[PDB]
Amino acid sequence: ATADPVKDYLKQIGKVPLLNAEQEVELAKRIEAGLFAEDKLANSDKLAPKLKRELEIIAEDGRRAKNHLLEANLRLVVSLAKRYTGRGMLFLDLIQEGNLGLIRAVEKFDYTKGYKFSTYATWWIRQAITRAMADQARTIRIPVHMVEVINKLARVQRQMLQDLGREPTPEELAKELDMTPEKVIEVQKYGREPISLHTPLGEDGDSEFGDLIEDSEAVVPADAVSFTLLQEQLHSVLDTLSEREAGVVSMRFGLTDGQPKTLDEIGKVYGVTRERIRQIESKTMSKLRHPSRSQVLRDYL
Amino acid sequence: AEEEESGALRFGVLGPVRAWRDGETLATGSPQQRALLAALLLREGRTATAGELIDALWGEEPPSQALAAVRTYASRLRKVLDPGVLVSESGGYAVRGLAEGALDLARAQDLASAAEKARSAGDLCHARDLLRRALDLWDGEVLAGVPGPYAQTQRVRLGEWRLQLLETRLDMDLDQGCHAEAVSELTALTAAHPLRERLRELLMLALYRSGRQAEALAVYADTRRLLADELGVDPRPGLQELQQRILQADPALA
Amino acid sequence: DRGIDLAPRQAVEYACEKGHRFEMPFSVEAEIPPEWECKVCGAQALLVDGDGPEEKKAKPARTHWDMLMERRTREELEEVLEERLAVLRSGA
């Protein structure tokens, strides 16, 4: 009810009864009792209503025992989640994801292996915690196999650093891990953490890092003025040429509309051969290629 | 013939689309396939994405589901060329393994740069030999039978580059003391292209010292008539200036 | 935006299981899909010519009983069940 809900959660765990061996094997037997009983209830066969109510009571007892096992094992998941904390994900979120891993773990347990719950649960705790850390910690999502590759590379790079006391070349790390050096460069480029936009610059407080960046998508008024003047000048030089030449060039690059047209496409509405239409087209390109009608367009690029 | 090493794969864009694999030809295939291989050849080995190649082949309206079409064109290139000469990154296509002299375009820039360096150094024989080798590079019209307005763009660009290259060749031929083949080439090119002012200025310069004045000014009058009929403007002041100094017959530039 | 002619657009009505009806446009040349989301609640949209579930079962996640089936067999299920009934009778 106060601040620091980590303390509130730890007290919300409370004085749960820790389970010595016969207690949790009896609880697991009751789990099986409830689960097989509700499985029998799930069948569509008609039995006595009293037997159905008894099986429902067993199912409720099994659910209660499942709950009790959860509150018994919230201690171990808290003790294990703290091992992987302070790495971009919050401590209580790690606790909750480990709780997901533990409720996945206990569901897949059988009493045939006479082992304690710790050595079987810790595998799923570590697996779910590292999967959640791979999936949700970074702002850009990295798949779990990429995460395990990159942090294996990080740990062997740290081993190299503590071994020879010097920064290794990427070629050495590539050849000692049997991947290509360009792959190593790519994966350590991928393995980066973004910096927040709202970082203060220094003594000044109003000046932030966010106002220093520009945007390439911003429209430049000079560019738009150049574009509309290019359109106007192109229309003017089209009007400068002959009417038929203007008409044939207006369709070859589809200047009038959004679609260009081929020489065979315009040979029906106007009715000339491919030879003549391409000849007059190339004549128009040559005439516009003359240096007289170039300075009006050469600076326009 | 002296640069035909073993294992050499020669590529050519200045003439038509062809491949020389140690002296034997390779079937470059479809006209769109020829355009695709040329578009990879102009980029000196970029990984160029699929959409860019699709735009390069066709332009504004490529068929919608033709990405697999470009995929099977790439398959055609990979099975007709070496498996390792073409490599794909992130969906882009890239031709590598191109040594010196494999592309005629790279040799063309190399010869142009060497000719410019020899002109800077003042040499004439080596520069003449370099541009003689350069004029043997083009074989007919550049990019023979390839669609795409992109292909039209590098076609007109390479044609203009060839025009300035022949302008420089004719200019050094005039300054070193060559006139007969010079006026022959200028007449042939003005027969081919009638609306270039620079080549007709070169005609005036070449005929001005080779012993020909009447037909030079007749060609100039024809140029004025055609330029007034088709453009209705006045030619460049350097022209009128060149015709002017010609008129008082200065022997300074002999 | 001057002189550009827009593509022809057709109105296709999508209806969900909750009765929400909304109108959104499609291109004429574009294919009409019978599957779409709901603008109001995000439910599955139907009632566009022919439509169906198209295997909405989607391999539903295994329940505890499926895990139990791996852990224990048929005759084990029967014997554990009667053992638990015996525990009930002992406790009653």
DSSP string, A199-215: -B-SS-SS-BGGGT---
Answer yes or no: are the C-beta atoms of B171 and B207 closer than 8 Å: no
Question: How long is chain C?
Answer: 92
- Using DSSP's 3-state secondary structure scheme, residue A147 falls into helix
C 3-62 residues with CB < 8 A to A = 3-5
C27: phi then psi, degrees, rounded to nearest 5: -75, 150
Q: Determine whether the interchain pair A293/B197 forms a contact, defined as Cβ–Cβ distance below 8 Å.
A: no
How far the first Cα of chain A sits from its last, in Å, is: 69
Contact at CB, C84 and A58, closer than 8 angstroms = yes
DSSP letters along A44-100, please?
-----HHHHHHHHHHHHHHHHHHHHHHHHHHHHHHHHHGGG-SSSS-HHHHHHHHHH
Do B242 and B206 form a contact (C-beta atoms < 8 A)? no
Of B188, C84, C30, which Cα lies nearest the Cα of A58? C84
Contact B233 A254 (CB under 8 A): no
What tokens were used for B99? Answer: 């040594």
Distance CA(B184)–CA(B186), nearest Å, equals: 6
Does the beta-carbon distance from B233 to A292 stay under 8 Å?
Answer: yes
**How many Å apart are CA A78 and CA B178, to the nearest integer?**
95
Flag whether residue A209 sits within 8 Å of chain B, measured between CB atoms: no
User: Which residue type, as a one-letter code, is found at position A247?
Assistant: G
Distance CA B164, CA B199 (A): 10
B13: closest CA among B80, B116, B102? B102
Q: Measured between alpha carbons, how far apart are the two ends of chain B, in Å?
A: 40
Residue B152, φ and ψ in degrees, nearest 5: -65, -35
C86 and A CB contact within 8 Å = no
C81 contacts A37? CB cut-off 8 A: yes
Whether the CB of A260 is below 8 Å from some CB of chain B: the reply is yes
Tell me if A174 sits within 8 A of A184, measured CB to CB.
yes
In sequence order, what are the beta bridge partners of B24? B21
Q: How far is CA B77 from the centre of its chain?
A: 25
Q: CA geometry: angle at B79 spanning B75 and B84, to 5°?
A: 95
Burial class (CB within 10 angstroms; exposed 0-12, middle 13-18, buried 19+) of B57: buried
- Burial class for A239, CB neighbours closer than 10 Å (0-12, 13-18, 19+): exposed
Entry resolution (Å): 3.7
Q: Which residues 6+ apart lie within 8 Å of A137 measured at CB?
A: A87, A88, A89
Which distant-in-sequence residues (6+ apart) come within 8 Å of A282 by Cβ? none
Interface A-C: count of C-beta contacts within 8 A: 36
Residues of C in contact with A257 (CB under 8 A): 3, 5
Torsion angle, alpha carbons of A128, A133, A139, A143, to 10: -70
CA distances from A51 to A32, A93, C83, C85 (A): 18, 43, 14, 9
State the smallest CA–CA distance between residue A40 and chain C in angstroms.
8
Query: What technique was this entry resolved by?
Result: cryo-EM
Residue C60's alpha-carbon distances to C45, C55, C57, C66, in angstroms, are 21, 11, 6, 11
The alpha-helical segments, DSSP class H, found in chain C are 64-71, 74-91
Residue B25 in 3-state DSSP? strand
Contacts A292 to B, Cβ<8 Å: 227, 231, 233
Q: What whole-number distance in Å separates Cα of residue A30 and Cα of residue A66?
A: 9
CB contact under 8 A, C71 and A257: no
The answer to whether the CB of B19 falls within 8 A of the CB of B10 is yes
User: Which of B134, B140, B29, B40 has the alpha carbon at shortest distance from B79?
Assistant: B29
Asked if B184 contacts B175 with a C-beta cutoff of 8 angstroms, the reply is no
A216 backbone dihedrals φ, ψ, rounded to 5°: -75, -25
The span from the CA of B195 to the CA of A287, in Å, is 8
For residues B150 and A255, give the distance between their C-alpha atoms in angstroms, rounded to a whole number: 17
Put simply, the answer to whether A32 touches C80 (Cβ < 8 Å) is: yes
A37 close to C (CB below 8 A):
yes
* DSSP string covering B110-148: HHHHHHHHHHHHT-SHHHHHHHHHHHTT--SSSSTT--S
For residue C88, the chain A residues in CB contact (below 8 A) are: 54, 58
Whether the CB-CB separation of B195 and B189 falls below 8 Å is answered with: no
The three-class DSSP label of residue C60 is coil
Is the CB of A291 inside 8 Å of chain B's CB atoms?
A: yes
CA distance C58 to A76: 36
- Residue B11 · residue B98 · CB < 8 Å: yes
Say if residue B29 is exposed, middle or buried (CB neighbours under 10 Å; 0-12, 13-18, 19+).
middle
* Closest CA–CA distance from residue A295 to any residue of chain B (Å): 12
Contact C43, C18 (CB under 8 A): yes
Q: What angle do CA B6, B11, B14 make, to 5 degrees?
A: 140
C-alpha A285/C-alpha A272 separation (Å) is 19
Contact status, residue B179 vs residue B210, Cβ threshold 8 Å: yes
Which residue reads 């370099």 in tokens?
Answer: B130
d(CA B201, CA B178): 16
CA distance A121 to B128: 85
The tokens 């030089």 sit on which residue?
Answer: A237
CA angle B226, B232, B236 (to 5 degrees): 80
Give A-chain residues touching B89 at CB under 8 angstroms.
none
Q: Where are the beta strands (DSSP E) in B90-235?
A: 92-95
- Is B231 within 8 Å of chain A by CB? yes
CA distances from B133 to A242, B104, B183 (A): 42, 11, 20
Single out the residue of B49, B117, B37 nearest to residue B88, CA to CA: B49
User: Which residue reads 């367009």 in tokens?
Assistant: A297
Kindly identify which residue of chain B lies nearest to residue A258, measuring between CA atoms: B60
Map residue C26 onto helix, strand or coil: strand
Helix (H, G, I), strand (E, B) or coil at C82: helix
> A260 and B149 in contact by Cβ < 8 A?
yes
| Chain C closest-CA separation from residue A29 CA (Å) | 9
Please give the span between the terminal C-alpha atoms of chain C, in angstroms, as a whole number.
85
Helix (H, G, I), strand (E, B), or coil: what is residue A109? coil
Burial of C56-69, coded b for 16+ CB within 10 Å and e otherwise, reads: eeeeeeeebeeebe
